[PDB]
Amino acid sequence: TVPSILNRMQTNQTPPTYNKTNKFTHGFQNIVDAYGIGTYREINPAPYT
Amino acid sequence: AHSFALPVIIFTTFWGLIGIAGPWFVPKGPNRGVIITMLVATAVCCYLFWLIAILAQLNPLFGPQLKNETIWYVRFLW
Amino acid sequence: LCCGPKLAACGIVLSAWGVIMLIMLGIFFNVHSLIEDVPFTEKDFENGPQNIYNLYEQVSYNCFIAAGLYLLLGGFSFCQVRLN
Fold this sequence. Notes:
This is part of a larger assembly, with chains A, B and C. By secondary structure, chain A is mainly alpha-helical.
């Protein structure tokens, strides 16, 4: 039972782009990703796609 | 015979309520943001396309060119 | 005959689509006795609009005949998939 504490660091490297998708929206996100992965905190075009 | 005003009233109300009132009646689940986006985008895209189709047919400059047998058939059909 | 269930399945889809299209088309010809306006009219056309109605009735009958063949095709193809 080690405390196992995960502590946030001054994030300062480029983080990955995580878009939550489901059974419906995943396909639309992929055809967007096919062109490229959006900038961190970029406006996701998929909800309009 | 048709007027233009009435089509506009009926379809503008139809698509308006969908894009305007629709978002008011949405579940609180994780898809709420997606459902609202779709409701509005759909109503705007569909309404605009139709509105173009109907407006483009106002104040026509010319009518159709029909074949003689076609012209006859219509005379005794409509 | 088996013929392969992949091809019998295709026949079922073609047969179902055909029956739907042929019935609907035959109705349209019978109602507007029309947009298609291709019933193969005579060149010696007289002042008898009833002649055009009669032509469409013939076209409609032919449409239902074709549908009947698709109904028979769907039946056969159906049993092939069930047996395969």
